[PDB]
């Protein structure tokens, strides 16, 4: 990220779709969980 | 003597055209690179143009000198 920031301050000529948000129509969700339960509702709290 | 005058006319034409070519090359190179550079850094255009005119002034002195002295000989010819 340090060199990324150095680049972008050096080259502010554009912001890619990967740095600035375009109007959203579908939003993606990366959801992590376990395969073994017996960990309280931690995963369940995340799901909620 | 009149052919000496033709010599003078030729010399003046040499100077004026050939220094004009000097300018035509220098200013063109500066323009091309300057456009490219300001494209790279479109923000500080003021100082960019500032130093650009700096260089432009530094550039074309002697060619204009040749032009002027050539025309001088064209009209105020020494030993007409």
Q: Quick one: which of B13, B43, B49 has its CA closest to B30?
A: B49
Look-up of token digits 């030729």: B10
Q: Give the span between the Cα atoms of B62 and B52, in whole angstroms.
A: 18
From the list B26, B60, B64, B74, the catalytic residue is B60
Within 10 angstroms of residue B61's Cβ, the number of other Cβ atoms is: 9
Torsion angle of the four alpha carbons B11, B16, B17, B20, in this order, in degrees rounded to the nearest 10: 150
Q: Experimental method used, please?
A: cryo-EM
Give me the residue spans of the domains in chain B. 1-80
Resolution (A): 4.6
Q: Is B60 a catalytic residue?
A: yes
């Amino acid at each position: 990220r340090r060199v990324i920031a150095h680049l972008v301050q050096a080259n502010p000529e554009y912001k890619h779709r990967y740095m600035v948000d375009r109007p959203v129509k579908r939003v993606g969700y990366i959801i992590v969980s376990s395969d073994r339960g017996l960990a309280g509702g931690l995963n369940i709290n995340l799901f909620k | 003597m009149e052919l000496t005058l033709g010599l003078v006319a030729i010399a003046s034409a040499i100077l004026i055209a050939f220094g004009a070519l000097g300018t035509a090359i220098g200013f063109g190179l500066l323009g091309g690179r300057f456009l490219e550079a300001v494209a790279r850094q479109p923000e500080l255009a003021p100082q960019l143009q500032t130093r650009m005119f700096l260089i432009a002034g530094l550039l074309d002195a002697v060619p204009m000198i040749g032009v002027g002295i050539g025309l001088f000989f064209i009209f105020a010819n020494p030993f007409v």
